[model samples]
Target: SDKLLGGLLASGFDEDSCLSRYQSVHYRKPSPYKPSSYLISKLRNYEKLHKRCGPGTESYKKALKQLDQECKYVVWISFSGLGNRILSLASVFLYALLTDRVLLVDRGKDMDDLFCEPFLGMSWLLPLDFPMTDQFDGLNQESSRCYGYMVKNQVITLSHLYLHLVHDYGDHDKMFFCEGDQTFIGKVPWLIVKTDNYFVPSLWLIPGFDDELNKLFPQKATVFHHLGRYLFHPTNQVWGLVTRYYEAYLSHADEKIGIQVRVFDEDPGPFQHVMDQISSCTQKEKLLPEVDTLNTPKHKAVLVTSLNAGYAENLKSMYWEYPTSTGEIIGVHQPSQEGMHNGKALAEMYLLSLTDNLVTSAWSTFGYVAQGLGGLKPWILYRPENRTTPDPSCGRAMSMEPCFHSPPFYDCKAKTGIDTGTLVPHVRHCEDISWGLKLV
Candidate 1:
């Protein structure tokens, strides 16, 4: 559980600037995992680094002047959906911590708009004047300066190039996961990374980083659980959305269950079968009290977050029609019905993060973010198979970690394809998706 509630160092920011920065602890319980003493010390040190090298600081200006120096920085530019962005940022932050580099976030279309500043005294954001800021949008696999392709072609030294970590990366791009690659990447002063996957598990497998990483995270699975909480605080406006929603709908419930539904189907759905699948999973797993459809319960709050309103509407109607087997009160709430394609989708994702007893959609980063943020190991609704509901619609999550959907398959030292999932007990295949990697 979260032992440190927003650590004591936070100050000076206008409360209104980011209300969630301070208000979030009240909405949820303390996290069970405490940061390792070493981790705490490192974070404190990181804050110091940011204070010194953060924007407008003398050290920052110096670092900027030497952007081409051997001292490198990994600026995480936002990409993909909110959940993807959240995971990538955490990966970048961990990379920054490990490499002893300052992290500068390129606040995409909605970062500053959605969340509060994580640091108290210094800005972690890259200033608009950054020389490479103009190139972030154009750095892709095909870019002439793409790191892996360049290395493969001998176009540029590994010591000064860009890594295209986006999903379509080549085998050469996969080398970035190796220790040898870290040696090269560590020296480059400007690293522009664009990724959607949570690359943490692979970082652990790098031989050189193992010892320090183990020390930083004795429980490997809690990496995101700890880092995410430390980094994300909704702006006061969003916090207001969270708190006002909580107080009005969730605060008084005897127990709260958060069900996140994300349909990846070509046809947008609130399909009857999806509802059936939801009920099947919840009832079988005892995630929610099974409704009698004939009898009633006293009271319960079901927090449902989905892009489509149909599922929530159906659940509400079902409860109104029948009582639960346990007579526990059942109420369903859907936070947003915005198209899951735009900024509104991001808002819905944040709303889901504030829930209790999370039920997540299989392989949805949207679900991943909520589960990690809430410090809740969720029951993942198995992805619908062959257009049919899974035999068992969902199962409980093993840890709070997000899955690496596409991990490097090669054993770096051996330079051959390997079943990476079997190589380590702590880093195993994800429960939600077999080929995916997650910290157990």
Candidate 2:
């Protein structure tokens, strides 16, 4: 049913081009939330705009001729790891939606290998011959066209502006969140953004966008849930991995649980503390049934994803060795254990998104992407300190939205420092990272 997704996705794309764009609904439960009609209309408009101004078009070619073109563009520079890149791209997409700028993604090395084109009748990937392609790597806050630098120097230009939204960005670089900065940057025809954080929470802080955002998302928490589903569709290869894994191991279960472990420790082993945290969170929260003498047979499938296989290995063993008190049958499986990121990681992430219940690690963008795509409000494992588990091993997330790891702390109007989290009811300190902000 096209109505199944509640107009979150625009229709009319070639179904053969991207199977996951429509077939994804078959593997997951229906969402209880309905997207605002305003958002649906905006997405339809964006699709038309993207088709008109997207790459290989007369409008796109004309816009490239000068900095004064009518159709503005925001170029997403592929800057970070797969997870960070995914989250940042969605953030940039939302920014583009609000500002009326066309979003063009720079494929970098592997984007084309991972995702399908989202917009109908147009590709979101930036063209190979784009004039500024070479400068993406060296662009920083100190660059002549860097927005923060220009703001500090009291200089303005119309050509283009580079926005430095990376985690380590300095105070001046953080001013991109300010209302005045947005107004100034909005006029620039071209914006080149390089970021790893999901900056949507801070976008709510900008007063200029408040009304528009409210209309776009009356249910504030669904920002990423709706937008992520609308934007990301896995390529056939990745979708094959997702569907095959689900049919083989996950689909028949009464419930599917996803646990994403991201160990920050330098040690290669999946430390005991992290494992304990996962067990504690799942069992205490009643997400997983405990072992007992009675063998009840309610089937459950647990999908674990991590850099180290140790966590999942141990989890699988525990369930295999013991029977749950409720007599529920539990099967724990992990698809990959490649220590570092590789092409297969994209498939693993998509597989994680197919689960019904999710447990995610703190500060892990990989987990954030899974939760957002799945529309799951995950149980976040608190980041351990000094290799020790937190007092509360984990806490349920306030919303399914991805946390903004590094957000601007400045008060736009006061011209002084203030806690951005405290200023708004919808945007608050994240459960995973207290300093971080997320839409509640």
Candidate 3:
């Protein structure tokens, strides 16, 4: 059924280098959003280009020779949540493709531990000796060369610019998402970007990238879906965790449901209100059958993944205390209690991807990453307000695409302001956050 998708090697990696890479797909339903032939060709071409120009070899040495000759390089420094970091890296890769520049990744503290090599024969990680490498982490909104801060301080320069794309960015910082600013930022040779947002939907609106983007993604929504699968194959160690868990717990379920709970509230939680919201939402939507709370049933497993493990523990207790109205049995499993894994968060995310139906928390990129990887459109648990659950505790996500949590609402050409969310049907307001943008 996928001869064109051939040559995607059954990943070659040591089991310990990164365990989740190869095994992730065992839980992932093969993506329905297949890459276009043209996109596939473009990727293959990009891989060749990376080999020729990527770090350390003679070609890379040749490219490096021009590091001072104004040769542009955009290196994305991983500086945020695991979900945000992954999305930003993909956006940077797309930028590299559009500009014909080599995409180099900042290794951060844990990237190499989570993913296998993305390029076939070369690596995308930035070289250790590259100039200005030490300054990546300290370049915040206050840095003199930072574009937004410079503009705010009445300074403008073409020599160098650092566009802060972080969530706390101001109106001027948000302007980096616009087309006009890209004209200036595109010229910087040693560009360092630190962000935790998908930011790709805004790139689609950039007039300069429009044609190339369409050529690469005829179906606009599959941008991340295709590229993510192509790029993020987990390492063998993580893959083992994924596969072993799948075989032991998930594979046997009549129907496996994944519930990802992320609470940002200050009080130590798995709060009562949050639990009530999740239960109310799933039962109302009919994604999960309502439990009888009176009589026991005979089938179903609920795979819950969360940082604190309180959510899973609570759910497990609920099922044990009461039987479902339907004769379906309910078993709950939680693989990891902690949320992050030295920048990877490998265990929690992999567990989340192995599910039949997903119930996710609102406004959590962690949830978004799992749903996107699973290629499952999920039922989102609306963010709680005043410690009370919303009227409709949850709603179906419009698409599996992750949201750009802090997208720019300004329109560059209009010179005033524009609601960027309304510009494209495919990129719309997120179900959880009315302001964020995501592909549909």
Candidate 4:
């Protein structure tokens, strides 16, 4: 098989610089969903445009001189945690593609360290000398240049507009999803966006962008699956962490199972209820065999990722202390137990992506990233209510796409408030968070 992924990836990159760019396909099974040729062509064209107009290029220098340049740009400001940033970056990249704007990234502090450059012959990282480098932290919904604030103030003739798409944004800020709003925004030479959501589902609802989106992604559910793989390639440092761990602990197993547990509590937790839920979900779903004192055994590798080690410890003890009914030999491993998202988190996420089957916590974008990159539809562990475990611990995800936790609920055509999830067949409510939306 060609490691270029059926032309989804360009051929000019040096494999040694970023091993994951070409070698990632080896760890996972073949993807059944093939990317559309139109989508592939568009990505190639986008890469060419990025090289021509990206930072340090003569075209970029010339465009920077004129406030009203023909080459429009959308700069993504670094915000949120690693998972949120990954999802939002993909969302913004898709938007840039649809709008024909050159995408630049404001690598806050760790972005350059976490990921390698995805575009060839160009840097997506915004130059340090950018005019408003210091102003990023101060930009908000009420800022003068903010698109929502300007629209409310009846000021539409601005050279640049800041788009605030964070979860806390108000009604006016949500207008970014409207077709009319996009028309005005399309004219601005510079557009800066700050978001922590995978807002792609709502983009499908916009009348102007809908048809083009349909052409780009005929199988609507694979939007993130294809784009995420194309855009993000971990540097050699992180790739080493992924490959070494997979080979040492996971390669020899008959089957691989990944469990990602995220406890949303103020306490640094490997909470008991959460641990119980993980065991319940896996055993109930027959993901792992029950204990038995029998003859020949099937080997299994269980990779658990969490902030605390208690959950993995419990599973490790259980499998070690007892024999499986089907004589299954279960080996449980945890790469790290860091209390917070640190540099090592990226490697663990990649390792999780290598599993044959996955069980992920509800409302966790970390889990979402692993599933999309792995091309596996995970069984979502429902968020517990009122400090108790959910009755049915987990349910299979409707699609592999990440959920848009915060999406616009406005109806652009009717000019009224409506439930966005009900309007489209492809865009439906998320399984984890009923009120949130996802592409299916």
Instruction: List the RMSD of every prediction in angstroms.
Output: 2.5, 1.8, 3.1, 1.7
Could you give the candidate ranking by TM-score, starting with the highest?
Answer: 4, 2, 1, 3
- For model 3, the local distance difference test gives 0.75
Instruction: Please provide TM-scores, in order, for all candidate models, with all chains considered together.
Output: 0.93, 0.96, 0.90, 0.97
Answer with 2 or 4, whichever has the higher TM-score. Answer: 4
In model 1, where is the ten-residue run with the lowest total lDDT? 1-10
Off by over 4 Å in 2: 2-4, 67-69, 293-296, 340-342
Which number leads on lDDT? 4
Off by over 4 Å in 1: 1-14, 67-71, 155-160, 293-298, 340-347
> Relative to the true structure, how large is the alpha-carbon lDDT of every model?
0.78, 0.87, 0.75, 0.89
Error of 3 at 84 (Å): 1.5
Model 4 CA deviation exceeding 4 Å by range: 67-69, 292-296
Candidate 4: clashing residue pairs, number: 4
TM-score of 2: 0.96
Local accuracy of candidate 4 as per-residue lDDT tens digits, 1-440? 45877678888888888888889778877777788999999898998899888898888887777645357799999999999999999999999999999999999988877788888778899999988779999999999989889778887646688999999887889999999999889888888999999999999998868998999999999998899988888888888888899889999998999999898888986677887788889999999977755556678999999988999999999999888777788999999988724457988888888899999989999999999988889999999987788889999999999999988899877889999999879999999999999999
Candidate 4, 51: how far from true, in Å? Answer: 1.4
Question: CA shift at 44, candidate 3, in angstroms?
Answer: 0.6
